[PDB]
């Protein structure tokens with residue numbers, strides 16, 4: 001069990017709850033002897049915008065810019081911007097990719113959305129054909145570790161926000177599964193801002209605890225039924 | 231009449247199918263006598279990252295940075311960065327906000343995600359109280375005009391991508407409904423890229439044609455049931 005983990009981390013403040021979850025991941029995975037890398041997006045001033053700056057070569061059509069076409073061709077030619085290919089190396093080497101982030105509008109913060117848009121390009125993360133179970137990152141695991149303002153009860157079928165799993169669909173299925181990841185069950189730390197000090201440490205320790213045995217876990221069945229029920 | 235429309239547009243290429251949909255909207259709504267404003271995020275090099283540059287002057291806590299709180303206060307205290315307040319003014323004035331974008335990872339392109347993250351701050355778009363039915367943008371309509379790479383066949387309950395309504399939930403319900411918008415039926419232009427000019431013109435025309443009677447429309451019931459039910 002010599003494993004490589006990439007944590008893609010998206011919080012502005014090292015002393016945040018997200019920051020603590022990120023750090024206990026690094027501590028506990030390091031302790032196990034795993035190889036660990038963190039992409040700290042805000043600290044890298046990570047570029048989120050999909051633009052023609054992401055290709056440095058001769059464009060396939062320089063008069064009508066098609067991001068998807070130009071990045072696919074640029075990946076094959078190796079003329080992608082280097083901040084993109086630096087992240088791809090990290091992914092390629094990883095056995096597990098953990099995403100650590102606060103929920104922003106039922107989704108990831110824009111800086112991490114940009115990571116997904118720019119890094120997971122055609123040719124690297126998927127092809128046509130070559131997606132979902134035939135996606136190019138098959139054999140890798142991914143895991144969303146999410147924090148929320150709202151409560152667990154708010155994130156139920158009958159609660160105001162609907163079930164937590166509803167908002168996971170575009171990320172777990174439309175992105176990770178599409179790229180061929182197997183998806184481990186999400187870690188959702190609900191409403192730490194509201195929680196007591198003891199409840200906070202508890203949530204942190206539950207994460208650290210889960211990580212002790214993460215390599216023994218099976219992935220979820222990443223299906224409409226899992227996310228939405230019958 | 232005197233209706234005000236903001237189009238928030240997220241495409242790199244003026245000649246794109248998205249560009250054409252935005253321009254038809256400008257043309258037809260202008261023709262009707264509406265007041266029309268376009269936020270061209272890519273042309274504006276719109277900042278998507280939520281950072282402490284979003285607050286001008288001195289922060290409520292320069293030691294430990296909490297984006298939500300710092301921007302809550304800054305809105306209340308009129309100290310938000312001008313790119314944000316410029317956008318908020320456009321929204322405040324609008325009766326209808328149309329979002330025009332290609333689908334990126336079952337969601338909006340990161341640059342548009344950044345607009346939602348940074349522009350729809352606490353105190354402007356929502357508060358305790360005032361969310362969902364009572365959110366601070368009540369009285370306004372919102373409409374998502376999405377283009378996809380995938381076919382309508384794939385975006386069904388049993389198709390590989392699941393029902394298009396599944397990916398609408400975080401946008402329509404978690405974001406737009408949450409802020410008080412009444413949400414018009416989405417405009418989904420499926421797989422323009424592989425369609426014939428005959429079918430493309432048809433999609434553009436349905437859009438122009440739909441815009442003729444947009445102000446007569448009923449909002450969808452923006453419910454978990456509308457999105458996931460039978």
Ligand SMILES: Cc1cc2nc3c(=O)[nH]c(=O)nc-3n(C[C@H](O)[C@H](O)[C@H](O)COP(=O)(O)OP(=O)(O)OC[C@H]3O[C@@H](n4cnc5c(N)ncnc54)[C@H](O)[C@@H]3O)c2cc1C
Nearest residue numbers: 016017018020102103104105106147148149150193200298
């Ligand atoms: C733009 C935006 C959009 C948002 N959209 C949504 C949304 O759609 N849905 C939703 O539910 N929420 C939403 N939120 C709220 C957001 O998800 C939460 O504020 C976020 O998840 C909280 O995590 P945090 O790291 O920022 O918390 P923090 O405020 O950093 O943490 C809470 C407390 O934990 C303490 N702490 C830190 N380390 C430890 C430690 N190791 N042990 C114990 N305590 C510790 C911190 O000091 C802090 O007091 C949004 C917020 C923003 C800004």
Ligand SMILES: Cc1cc2nc3c(=O)[nH]c(=O)nc-3n(C[C@H](O)[C@H](O)[C@H](O)COP(=O)(O)OP(=O)(O)OC[C@H]3O[C@@H](n4cnc5c(N)ncnc54)[C@H](O)[C@@H]3O)c2cc1C
Nearest residue numbers: 068246247248250332333334335336377378379380423430
């Ligand atoms: C990072 C990334 C992530 C993506 N994720 C997804 C995803 O999760 N799911 C998914 O389904 N797809 C996804 N896509 C694909 C994407 O949604 C489609 O490529 C996009 O919607 C195509 O729209 P467009 O405006 O760019 O098309 P274009 O290529 O610009 O347009 C299609 C054709 O219509 C022509 N046209 C333009 N104007 C007119 C007109 N007025 N009348 C007639 N014809 C006209 C254009 O010239 C062009 O030839 C992703 C793409 C990228 C780059």
Ligand SMILES: COc1cccc2c1C(=O)c1c(O)c3c(c(O)c1C2=O)C[C@@](O)(C(=O)CO)C[C@@H]3O[C@H]1C[C@H](N)[C@H](O)[C@H](C)O1
Nearest residue numbers: 105106148149150151154161191193194298299302404408
């Ligand atoms: C755009 O963000 C959202 C979008 C959709 C839903 C939501 C949110 C959201 O931000 C959010 C919250 O921030 C919070 C909650 C929440 O449900 C949501 C959403 O559902 C739960 C909460 O309000 C309580 O439990 C109150 O007792 C605490 C928390 O607020 C935090 C953040 C601020 N510091 C706030 O002033 C208060 C002190 O606690």
Ligand SMILES: COc1cccc2c1C(=O)c1c(O)c3c(c(O)c1C2=O)C[C@@](O)(C(=O)CO)C[C@@H]3O[C@H]1C[C@H](N)[C@H](O)[C@H](C)O1
Nearest residue numbers: 068069122128174178335336379380381384391421423424
């Ligand atoms: C990260 O993007 C995605 C994420 C999840 C699902 C999807 C996509 C996606 O991009 C996507 C597509 O781009 C395309 C399709 C699609 O289903 C998806 C997703 O489901 C359908 C398509 O392949 C055909 O209908 C061909 O007959 C055309 C189209 O391909 C685009 C790009 C190809 N390189 C080629 O240029 C083709 C003409 O258009």
Ligand SMILES: [Zn+2]
Nearest residue numbers: 173177222223
């Ligand atoms: Zn899946």
Ligand SMILES: [Zn+2]
Nearest residue numbers: 403407452453
């Ligand atoms: Zn709703």
